[PDB]
Design a protein around this ligand. Structure first.
Ligand SMILES: Nc1ncnc2c1ncn2[C@@H]1O[C@H](COP(=O)(O)OP(=O)(O)NP(=O)(O)O)[C@@H](O)[C@H]1O
Ligand SMILES: Nc1ncnc2c1ncn2[C@@H]1O[C@H](COP(=O)(O)OP(=O)(O)NP(=O)(O)O)[C@@H](O)[C@H]1O
Ligand SMILES: Cc1cn([C@H]2CC[C@@H](COP(=O)(O)O)O2)c(=O)[nH]c1=O
Ligand SMILES: Cc1cn([C@H]2CC[C@@H](COP(=O)(O)O)O2)c(=O)[nH]c1=O
Ligand SMILES: [Mg+2]
Ligand SMILES: [Mg+2]
Ligand SMILES: [Mg+2]
Lengths: 209, 209
């Protein structure tokens, strides 16, 4: 009985990390085997290049960095497939969607080109998109100092996210991330319990193919 | 008057590195501004991951390593465009073709998927393919100990190379690499002088688009 692959995507400060963490804790408290993953995963060789780039300690050509973000997901595929096959549900804090939306926000990057490297990755059974008015998201304190942490770039990534959501091959679920942390959690949790109960029914798919 | 982008591809031990070196020396002796590049370029962060992988000091998931080889070319695009625009012809010892042929030789890698990351790179004005009977190429001493240095894998990369050569958007030129080092050089050199003289006539193209 395989585990489910559940991804959280969403506007900046939309609550992806808080909800990913709470979701795993709640699933495990309700007797599921669930573990948390995030992207980028900064602990590998690739991830350390990505962390330095996001912190602006290094500059990386735009196509190269896009490919490194994708490679960073592929290096985890063997582990993802193994965990799911063993019945462990995986909750993932950002995935290929963020990859495509962020590079796709830069000038002269087509969505098609941005998606290709991630074609074939493990297909999520559930993709939650935490929706929040960009302005309320900036009221969630203030912008950090990493790359992309500005208003104009975020609006352009949001547009790309909306294009990806026309992709009917994927089980997208909109979440109203403007509610309290606990109210948002309870929405996410019920949609996740549903997905887990149906993921044991059809094999793990392949993304964008 | 832009420089030309000339790539050498070819079967193992076909003579790509020797000819790349001789070609640059001859072009410069004949008053051209020409410089040598190679892929993978093992001096960058990415290139050191690639060198360790090829030497088998490290194992890398197959999709991730394919993307790293491509990223390794994109990190050099800014320099490639700048050099060509300044009138410097660039002689390149392996390029995206080797990227696609080598991963494309592994099971379950489609040529389409393998080409995507390199879509958009600077399009070579001339692609020389050094042809040699795989057996005569093994008579060029013996196999080293790096990855892919075996007979069965080389035949499968050669097949992929032949599929890429049906790509009429590219100026492929077959070279008979079984002749002497000097005879092969003289063939390559004349085809290169021709390409350089025509590359000042149309803008640098984009690969596979
Ligand atoms: N529903 C919520 N209401 C109010 N504040 C929240 C809510 N969810 C999270 N926060 C706070 O807002 C900040 C961002 O939350 P976080 O879960 O880190 O978002 P995130 O989407 O992962 N951000 P990022 O990784 O920067 O895109 C943190 O201080 C959270 O405590
Ligand atoms: N035309 C030739 N005839 C005979 N030996 C040659 C010829 N060209 C190169 N060699 C020798 O064959 C070996 C391989 O040459 P090299 O130029 O390094 O090939 P290469 O294609 O770059 N190999 P690789 O990088 O391993 O695919 C070297 O010892 C060369 O001196
Ligand atoms: C997964 C992924 C992410 N991104 C961006 C989103 C914001 C930043 C991470 O920020 P956090 O580490 O704070 O989640 O990195 C990309 O540009 N491409 C990708 O493939
Ligand atoms: C450019 C490139 C190369 N290759 C392989 C060809 C043989 C080895 C390099 O060997 P040499 O360093 O000895 O040329 O690396 C890939 O697998 N993908 C690529 O994108
Ligand atoms: Mg977060
Ligand atoms: Mg060589
Ligand atoms: Mg396509």
């Amino acid at each position: 009985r395989r585990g489910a692959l559940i991804v959280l995507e969403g506007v900046d400060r939309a609550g992806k990390s808080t909800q990913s963490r709470k979701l795993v804790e709640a699933l495990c408290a309700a007797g599921h085997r669930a573990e948390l993953l995030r992207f980028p995963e900064r602990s590998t060789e690739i991830g350390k290049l990505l962390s330095s780039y996001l912190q602006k300690k290094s500059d990386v050509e735009d196509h190269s960095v896009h490919l490194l973000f994708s490679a960073n997901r592929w290096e985890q595929v063997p582990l993802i497939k193994e965990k799911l096959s063993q019945g462990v549900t995986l909750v993932v804090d950002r995935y290929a969607f963020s990859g495509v939306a962020f590079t796709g926000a830069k000038e002269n990057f087509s969505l098609d080109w941005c998606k290709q490297p991630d074609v074939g990755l493990p297909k999520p059974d559930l993709v939650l998109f935490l929706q929040l008015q960009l302005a309320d998201a900036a009221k969630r304190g203030a912008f950090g100092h990493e790359r992309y942490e500005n208003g104009a770039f975020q609006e352009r990534a949001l547009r790309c996210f909306h294009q990806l959501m026309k992709d009917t091959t994927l089980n997208w679920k909109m979440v109203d991330a403007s509610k309290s942390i606990e109210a948002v959690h309870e929405d996410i949790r019920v949609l996740s319990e549903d997905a887990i109960a149906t993921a044991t029914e059809k094999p793990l798919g392949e993304l964008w193919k």
